[PDB]
Amino acid sequence: MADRLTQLQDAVNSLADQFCNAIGVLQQCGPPASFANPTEEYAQLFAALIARTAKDIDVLIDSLPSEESTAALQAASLYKLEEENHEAATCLEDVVYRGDMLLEKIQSALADIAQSQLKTR
Amino acid sequence: GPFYLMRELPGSTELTGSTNLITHYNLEQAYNKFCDLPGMIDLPGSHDLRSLIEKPPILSSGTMLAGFRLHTGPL
Amino acid sequence: MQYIKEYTDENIQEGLAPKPPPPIKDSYMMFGNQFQCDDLIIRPLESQGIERLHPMQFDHKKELRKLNMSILINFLDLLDILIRSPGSIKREEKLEDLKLLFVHVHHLINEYRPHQARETLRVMMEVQKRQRLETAERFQKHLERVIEMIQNCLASLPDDL
Amino acid sequence: LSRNEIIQSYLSRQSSLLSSSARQLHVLVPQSPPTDLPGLTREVTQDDLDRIQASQWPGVNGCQDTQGNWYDWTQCISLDPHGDDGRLNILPYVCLD
């Protein structure tokens, strides 16, 4: 979850829910007639909410990606990234190898110093 | 250009519930009149148990021979 | 619920008498209750079952904005139905009509879902690559420091001698 | 379903607005006639991959904006499409890990 796409899905469903809620409120409750003010306030609030939801859906649509970046542009970039990841792997391996050799040398040197110091006693 | 699935709205003002249905249905003068017949019939008669039985029969739904066989004395 | 007992009876044996794993199925299976035949498209098309309002120009963002505006205008026309003639036939069409519109607004953005999927692989790979190089550089700096550390301590020792 | 009351209707209001939400919108993007596999059909090249890796491409590598701030796919965009205090918060498109 937590994507712009799930936000857009929930916004569209909230639009449909505001449609059903707006009709079910503004038909069920009203002042009778003449051949109330709370109902008028309800209508204004519902219209404002529907407009805001529409604007948000439009903004999220603008936000997602274009009809450029077709799937082949993703695939070729993926191929190039696999090659460069191989090269980065071998480079990391080389630096680790040099560090390992240097570490084994200094370790053996320190062991020999300790052996001499214990043998002198 | 055109939105998806536009169509034609119905005839501008056909029969609705927003019209005055009574004045269209020629019932105005009866209402303007209207807005007991026990008492209006007691204009003719005296007053208005077995009348409960009359209403219960309402809720449920040889004349010379009778005059000859109606023998009963006065006093 | 039950336990496959015939194959578990088969398994208690020695030598080479136990059984091999079954081969891979490349056709219709019947797992659970649905079929789940292989080689399915991730997004089964809209032409299999419902109408299709949009051509092959299919520039997704424009048609999504079009379908948003069409949903709102058909809601307004449904309000015109409820104002003018509630007993009309058209409202049934109208209460079907925007339903079809809502289906398409879901069906387009589900077509962003493979793309999003592919795209998250791409950025993961980029982040993967960058982290490798960062560790490499980090380690090399440490290596350099260790080298010069050893050097200056060696630079100290004939000065004791 | 049968009855909607002030408190319950206001509950519907705050729940719907918390689910949903001077311009500060994204810069508009036009239609794109050059697309890489179907439309323009570029033989696999190299400028396009270098643009998709390093440069700023506003349809592919991120979402651009008015007031200039660039946002790639892993970031969350804060905007205000209305003239209110309420801010739209577009979540990240990728959400790595």
From Swiss-Prot, chain A:
GO terms of biological process kind: blastocyst development; positive regulation of transcription by RNA polymerase II; positive regulation of transcription elongation by RNA polymerase II; positive regulation of transcription initiation by RNA polymerase II; protein ubiquitination; regulation of transcription by RNA polymerase II; RNA polymerase II preinitiation complex assembly; somatic stem cell population maintenance
UniProt feature coiled coil, ranges: none
Single Gene Ontology MF annotation: transcription coactivator activity
Protein localization: Nucleus
One Pfam family per UniProt: Med21
SUPFAM superfamilies: Mediator hinge subcomplex-like
Job description of the protein: Component of the Mediator complex, a coactivator involved in the regulated transcription of nearly all RNA polymerase II-dependent genes. Mediator functions as a bridge to convey information from gene-specific regulatory proteins to the basal RNA polymerase II transcription machinery. Mediator is recruited to promoters by direct interactions with regulatory proteins and serves as a scaffold for the assembly of a functional preinitiation complex with RNA polymerase II and the general transcription factors.
Matching PANTHER family: MEDIATOR OF RNA POLYMERASE II TRANSCRIPTION SUBUNIT 21 (PTHR13381:SF0), RNA POLYMERASE II HOLOENZYME COMPONENT SRB7 (PTHR13381)
Family to which this protein belongs: Belongs to the Mediator complex subunit 21 family.
Name by which UniProt lists this protein: Mediator of RNA polymerase II transcription subunit 21
Organism in which the protein naturally occurs: Homo sapiens
From Swiss-Prot, chain B:
Function: Component of the Mediator complex, a coactivator involved in the regulated transcription of nearly all RNA polymerase II-dependent genes. Mediator functions as a bridge to convey information from gene-specific regulatory proteins to the basal RNA polymerase II transcription machinery. Mediator is recruited to promoters by direct interactions with regulatory proteins and serves as a scaffold for the assembly of a functional preinitiation complex with RNA polymerase II and the general transcription factors.
Family: Belongs to the Mediator complex subunit 19 family.
Protein's organism: Homo sapiens (Human)
Subcellular location as annotated: Nucleus
Protein name: Mediator of RNA polymerase II transcription subunit 19
Range of the intact protein held here: 63 to 159 of 244
Subunit structure: Component of the Mediator complex, which is composed of MED1, MED4, MED6, MED7, MED8, MED9, MED10, MED11, MED12, MED13, MED13L, MED14, MED15, MED16, MED17, MED18, MED19, MED20, MED21, MED22, MED23, MED24, MED25, MED26, MED27, MED29, MED30, MED31, CCNC, CDK8 and CDC2L6/CDK11. The MED12, MED13, CCNC and CDK8 subunits form a distinct module termed the CDK8 module. Mediator containing the CDK8 module is less active than Mediator lacking this module in supporting transcriptional activation.
UniProtKB/Swiss-Prot annotation, chain C:
Signal sequence, start to end: none
Molecular functions (GO terms): transcription coactivator activity; ubiquitin protein ligase activity
GO BP annotation list: positive regulation of transcription elongation by RNA polymerase II; positive regulation of transcription initiation by RNA polymerase II; protein ubiquitination; regulation of transcription by RNA polymerase II; RNA polymerase II preinitiation complex assembly; somatic stem cell population maintenance; transcription initiation at RNA polymerase II promoter
PTM per Swiss-Prot/TrEMBL: Constitutively sumoylated.
Disulfide partners: none
Domain of life: Eukaryota
GO CC term, one of those recorded: nucleoplasm
Keywords: Activator, Isopeptide bond, Nucleus, Phosphoprotein, Transcription, Transcription regulation, Ubl conjugation
Compartment(s) where it occurs, according to its Swiss-Prot or TrEMBL record: Nucleus
Chief place of localization: nucleus
Family membership noted in the UniProt record: Belongs to the Mediator complex subunit 7 family.
General function of this protein: Component of the Mediator complex, a coactivator involved in the regulated transcription of nearly all RNA polymerase II-dependent genes. Mediator functions as a bridge to convey information from gene-specific regulatory proteins to the basal RNA polymerase II transcription machinery. Mediator is recruited to promoters by direct interactions with regulatory proteins and serves as a scaffold for the assembly of a functional preinitiation complex with RNA polymerase II and the general transcription factors.
Record-given protein name: Mediator of RNA polymerase II transcription subunit 7
Organism this protein belongs to: Homo sapiens
Full-length numbering of the shown residues: 15 to 175 of 233
UniProtKB/Swiss-Prot annotation, chain D:
Subunit (UniProt): Component of the Mediator complex, which is composed of MED1, MED4, MED6, MED7, MED8, MED9, MED10, MED11, MED12, MED13, MED13L, MED14, MED15, MED16, MED17, MED18, MED19, MED20, MED21, MED22, MED23, MED24, MED25, MED26, MED27, MED29, MED30, MED31, CCNC, CDK8 and CDC2L6/CDK11. The MED12, MED13, CCNC and CDK8 subunits form a distinct module termed the CDK8 module. Mediator containing the CDK8 module is less active than Mediator lacking this module in supporting transcriptional activation.
PTM annotation (Phosphoserine): residues: 32
Its job: Component of the Mediator complex, a coactivator involved in the regulated transcription of nearly all RNA polymerase II-dependent genes. Mediator functions as a bridge to convey information from gene-specific regulatory proteins to the basal RNA polymerase II transcription machinery. Mediator is recruited to promoters by direct interactions with regulatory proteins and serves as a scaffold for the assembly of a functional pre-initiation complex with RNA polymerase II and the general transcription factors.
Species name: Homo sapiens (Human)
Highest taxon listed in the record's lineage: Eukaryota
Compartment list: Nucleus
Family to which the UniProt record says this protein belongs: Belongs to the Mediator complex subunit 26 family.
Name this polypeptide is given: Mediator of RNA polymerase II transcription subunit 26
Location of this fragment in the whole protein: 480 to 600 of 600
Segments passing through the bilayer: none
